Symmetry: D2
Subunit: 517 residues, 4 copies
């Protein structure tokens, strides 16, 4: 039996491509889809972080909706300690990126009985009074809930719907007031502490980048984070507000815009052009818009991101049951596989790794599903379509990238080795979605960390000193990439690989089809 679903790859129709998908055809060793994991109490120790990197974590996500600046600074220190514990072997060292997820214009409840882990049961048809009196921030119960959004009574109306936690608890405003709302519980359950609140039909007037967000962003600039997941972005000027706060010191920090509402979907095109990447944050999105329409927004945003060549992240509840169970549901396995088939550069875990009981199992399961799904990609149709929709340009590097991907398909290349300084040449290869893994050799540690945003880029950080002869320096990094693929099992001596370098000390314009040793 052939491997990597190569029999399905030869199908002349997408229907026959489906008919040839073989569970007995093993995939390749390399996994092209990046894995972003949210760090929390269940994954903050250096010990867990080490195994998580070994399990397939590429980006550590820090959710600034919780915790103080000292809490996150320790998380960053632990991430770097666990990551650098493998730095002794540059061939096996896997770079790990650090991502700052902003709180954003969030609405959160108060503390229930005074404990963040405490909870209180709610019943259907019961009455719960929402208050803005700060005398009940930590005195929330089954009858009084405190909110942090002071202007709620001016944006919701009688008969409006209010959702708590992840849309699980629903409330309808029956009575209004100056600083209180009397709502009826429809969908009862356990109400916890500091849970998220959504007002779908309302136009929340909270700042896209609040003062806390500005302070949190400056903290990220000082901690040398690699990217920013900016929450509740609904327009391009919001993306710009984040970039100005990052200022000159953080020019190279990637801004990933999170689409979590209808306006963000409506204004997606202007948002995508202004951002470095997009996150389909299905948690809030699944509450702001009807649940049955979320898959339309996901496939649309991933499609437009592939067309523009910018990274897109599918996130939230991909393996939600693994928070309490060691194995996912069949729906969860399909969701991860379908996200990769959609064309998502990265898949995310947020809860399965931050607080769940099986954080390692969740990361390995994502690694396994993404690997199987990448082989099931209909590369024949995907590559030609990406070719037909690519604007014609006289940029020599873009021609080198598409020429490398085409050559990698013709000879079934073991890898595409790209020597890059900023990552751009490597990104231009990933935009055409080659089957072969992209080994991006760089001396810049930031671009090595940021390379995980693009599908298929395996960044390797060269710590060897710069040779005086440029041809020797190039040959060093290529040989460095050769040893990485050999040691990681991507290729072996005698296999064929594509090598992307420059010809003279500017941009990658040289393409070589070389044997491995």
């Amino acid at each position: 039996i052939q491997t990597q679903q190569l029999h399905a790859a030869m199908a002349d129709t997408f229907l026959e491509h489906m008919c040839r998908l073989d569970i007995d055809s093993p995939p390749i060793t390399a996994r092209n889809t990046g894995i972003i994991c949210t760090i929390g109490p269940a994954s903050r120790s250096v010990e867990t972080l080490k195994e998580m990197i070994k399990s397939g974590m590429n980006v550590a996500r820090l959710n600034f909706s919780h915790g103080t600046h000292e809490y996150h600074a320790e998380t960053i220190k632990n991430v770097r300690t666990a990551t650098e514990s493998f730095a002794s072997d540059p061939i096996l060292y896997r770079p790990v990126a650090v991502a700052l997820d902003t709180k954003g214009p969030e609405i959160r409840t108060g503390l229930i009985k005074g404990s963040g882990t405490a909870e209180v049961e709610l019943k259907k048809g019961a009455t719960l009074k929402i208050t803005l009196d700060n005398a009940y921030m930590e005195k929330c119960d089954e009858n009084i809930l405190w909110l942090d959004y002071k202007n709620i009574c001016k944006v919701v109306e009688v008969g409006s719907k209010i959702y708590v936690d992840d849309g699980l608890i629903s409330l309808q405003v029956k009575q209004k007031g100056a600083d209180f709302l009397v709502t009826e519980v429809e969908n009862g359950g356990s109400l916890g502490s500091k849970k998220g609140v959504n007002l779908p039909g309302a136009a929340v007037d909270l700042p896209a980048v609040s003062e806390k967000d500005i302070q949190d962003l400056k903290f990220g600039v000082e901690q040398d984070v690699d990217m920013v997941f900016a929450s509740f972005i609904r327009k391009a000027s919001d993306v710009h507000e984040v970039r100005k706060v990052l200022g000159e010191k953080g020019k190279n920090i990637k801004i990933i815009s999170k689409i979590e509402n209808h306006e963000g979907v409506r204004r997606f095109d202007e948002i995508l052009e202004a951002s470095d990447g997009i996150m389909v944050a299905r948690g809030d999105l699944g509450i702001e818009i009807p649940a049955e329409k979320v898959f339309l927004a996901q496939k649309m945003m991933i499609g437009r991101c592939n067309r523009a060549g910018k990274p897109v992240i599918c996130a939230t509840q991909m393996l939600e049951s693994m928070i309490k169970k060691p194995r996912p549901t069949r729906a969860e396995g399909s969701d991860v596989a379908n996200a990769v088939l959609d064309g998502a550069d990265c898949i995310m875990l947020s809860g399965e790794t931050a607080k769940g009981d099986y954080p390692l199992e969740a990361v390995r399961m994502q690694h396994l599903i993404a690997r199987e799904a990448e082989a099931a990609i209909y590369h024949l149709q995907l590559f030609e379509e990406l070719r037909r929709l690519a604007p014609i340009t006289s940029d020599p590097t873009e021609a080198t990238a598409v020429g490398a991907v085409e050559a990698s398909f013709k000879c079934c290349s073991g890898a595409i080795i790209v020597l890059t300084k900023s990552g751009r040449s490597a990104h231009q290869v990933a935009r055409y979605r080659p089957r072969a893994p992209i080994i991006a050799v760089t001396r810049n540690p930031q671009t090595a960390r940021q390379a995980h945003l693009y599908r298929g880029i395996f960044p390797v950080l060269c710590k060897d000193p710069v040779q005086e002869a440029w041809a020797e320096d190039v040959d060093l990094r290529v040989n460095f990439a050769m040893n990485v693929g050999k040691a990681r099992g991507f290729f072996k001596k005698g296999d064929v690989v594509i090598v992307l370098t420059g010809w003279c000390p500017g941009f990658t314009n040289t393409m070589r089809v070389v044997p491995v040793p």
Copy 2:
């Protein structure tokens, strides 16, 4: 724009995705059938009436549990709620009845103590699986009885044993002809009569057991519309089910359930022998690695679409809705991608049998499937189905593919097909048109069995046969006109396709 028609005109699948519009409302008609498992939560006539209104098309009865007395009351309640809408044939919705056989299953004994007595299995503990029937009703943390008497002949040291949907995992360390000491790998609250899986073993249990025979015969007496045959491994298994149904139940459809590696490997011969396929991801996710299930699902749905047989994607599609009133983002995506794969039917098993939100589950499947039907890249699917269609001289196939083509060119409100056995309407559903298929029939069984096919909206006509054949056809056609008008599928001045008669007449007619 509506029906995602701006995306439907894209010349590339990538642009078809880019044009998916959450503000583009779908049509009223919902093409994908919804099969619901009946249990304590949805067994009552009053709840069953709401189930039909919520969008339920097929009632599924899991014979792995319950007596014949229990299921006969379920079937009695299903027909009572269904026939309570029979006073209006325009609005009457036919509901099929499906029997899910137990099959070659492996289940644990009753834990010691109460019937609800559960035990706890801790990771790093030992457990001795036994056949001694003395512990059949005396299971605990140390001993555990199984109903598979040949387990010691197919398993060896180092193999894995799964209990309770693979949530509990065991590793056998020392094997004997009577005892099997094992090491708990995961662990959890272990209950009674829980299913057991042996992935690396070749279980030699009968495909159609003694209990399966009496259940199948019982299904024939209860006039069931279809049978779901569990753990079908080879085409010879399908023939055994057909043999039991015999002459009395020759018209009952056999939907083979693929649940193991052997069934996937022999899917071609199983599909040829069966009337349909159920991708039963529950056991399949335990018999083969979980990360490979989506390959088997997309393979089986594709091959069934290629063969024109109905395929069902099942199990845990909206699992979190058992306890919660809203699904997860992965579950909403799982339903949509199942419909985008090409699945004729989607199923609920626990979300409707024992869950706290059975009507919400059905309602959610209705919303996602209708939304996913409009997002189907009909342009590429039709071309590929035509190209890959086996060449025939059958006049009925040329008429069927002509009606679907004509339904695209004019974006018809529906395709009205007059049929007795349903084969005419099935030949239209094979090419997967966007417009709904209003299949008018007088055969009650045909109207119930029609739910297995995508897009077929069956309507039962109880009018007597007129002497003049042209008089009778015009009545059935007008009965379909009033149905599509009442259900909001089309309106006066809209254009629909009519298929009459072998079926050889195709008409484009404005709605009166």
Copy 3:
């Protein structure tokens, strides 16, 4: 297998080419209409009879020459030869009459069959003095375009005999032109003249054209080939001249210059059809660009569902020889493969020595080319590019063609009054021949403009029961296909009819076995 069905099953156009089999015989039916120019070599009733037997469907009358009496006799002979087969409606082939306009032509003077040798590099003076009209020589030349000096410039090119003689304008006199011969040759009398880069100021419809068009309305012509159409307003002038009496006369606009190509879209919308008139076009634009205009116009006509004619010099060597050249054989096949509804002969039939051999050769090539069409790709593209509409006939038509591919129908039988339902089927280009049954003799004749339509004229009286009248005409189409070899009983065909007497639209499709 036959009709290149192995090449038709190819999944790529390259493999479709690789499977083209010279040993795969085509079907009996020929879908491309053949238009033949009548002249001294083909005007007799006897010769016209053999032309119909050889495959002639439309008779073209070139009104650049001949008087109204000469042409009236031609039509009488055409109708005499055509009606000589009227005794058997099963084998009767309708024949159309087409009037080719004189148009804004420029013609030289008179030099008694006298010929003058023009030498390269010599000086040739073009004058407008009507005193040199009958005295044309190697030194002085007279034209009938009295406004030539105001539209041509110094350095412009002038062509004098179907592009054979080339001239370059060196000086611009008060009422004359001083040119330099570039491509010399034998200069005759009253030869056509082309001014490529100039904006000719001649009326689109001249006084002679008005009378010749009125003559066409009175002689009951089926179509008009309107010469040198350059804009939509020209087509309207032709439509207004035809008036109410000739409202149903199809106007085929002839594209013969750059402006006609540049403004093609406005011309096509206003016309009933298009002719790629490559004679003048090959002189007004560079010859190497003509195939670009030909394939563009044929493509846009296929997209709009309007008839297109490829014309001029398709078998030019057959004027003097009994066999065509390899370039001529390829040209006809490529015109059919491009998507042309009709192919034309103009000279190979009017004055050549082998008029019948030219008609049979077009019939043979068109039949072979029709089988080599990549119907798989063509139908898919025509399907994807077809505007979505709620017209019941359009849905029925595309459904019939789809069904004919699914079952390899032997034919598509269409019952039509005006021809529209048959035209709507032909626009999707089915492989099977379309048998259009009609009682209207004009729609039977005009149907030859559309590819694949085999018109048959039913002379039986209208039955009182509509179902009997439908069954009569359908059975008539069955006997026609049987006698002509389109199918044998047991074959499958598609039948397009109405549903009620007086529905007003073709809405019923039946896949029936052949009687």
Copy 4:
């Protein structure tokens, strides 16, 4: 826009036709080679010089007429005219020499192969006979065709053996083998050429039904194919020739072997200064079919306007090359290409893909034998392939492939391979600039090796 780039972006072939623009000017480079038959009208050194200036790439010598001294002289005039431009290596265009064999010809055991009622055709099918049907003017020593008969004449006669060895001694670049009917016939030609002429390309001419029926054996055994429509149009029905032409051109494109469309492409230009509309369509459609080369045989040997015929083919081929639906053609050639791990094929297809992405002005290929240039032309790029070589034979033989513009580098080999590469690459830059293919600032694709022997390096560089 230019080069029919608006029509190139169409998503369907029908829309590609609808967008063909007579006002969209083509590029300067002409990719289709032009083969001209030399005769009394084109043998002078003066005329041959103008013939090269008009666009002639291959000189064809028809050994059906003339003695060895006539043909030996003709080669001398061709080489004299060709080398008259050798003083400037940037403007020198190599010219190939082709030997067209007489073959098993019949000209005015016949009684043992025909029967009563059989057809006999004389001249170019102009006179018909039944054992007179189509009368006419009969000349001396005219060709005769027996369509339904199985002629038992030797595939390679004694005259052919002596004529083929004569080609080996005159250093011809290729042989046009007439009336090839089987693979064993092609092998007979290779044996006569022997070891001394192993590198002489054999182009098999398909002129009868058996040749079409046995086409697959002939393509595998030959270096190239000629659709010789003259004899083919008499042996098989005239209306069926376009089927054989499109079949043979397709199978050659699939196999990556050169194919020549020949005979009567501009036949009326023997006596007239302008072609017919059918002739213009024939040349353009042959290029659209995928023909590597187009031929003239009579329009250049004896006609009154040999130069005008060469320029007209040059103009039509350039116009037709822009009208090719490259989008579908490249995708189909890619999907139908056997999967291989050969770095040169991966390098070649990557260069063609990159040339489409940046609309490159040229694809510069540094090659010794021509293989790397041939592998690029098989994927049919829109951009011209400038093949830089030091081998003079491969420069002449490169004209058989569509799009290859050969340039002969006479500069000495530099010691550092990087300097030799930079020398030859800049040589290609000066050639394309001097010919108007590109200008400074344009982008081109450069194909070289990586070490001082497979071509594996591709560079996307601006024109200096």
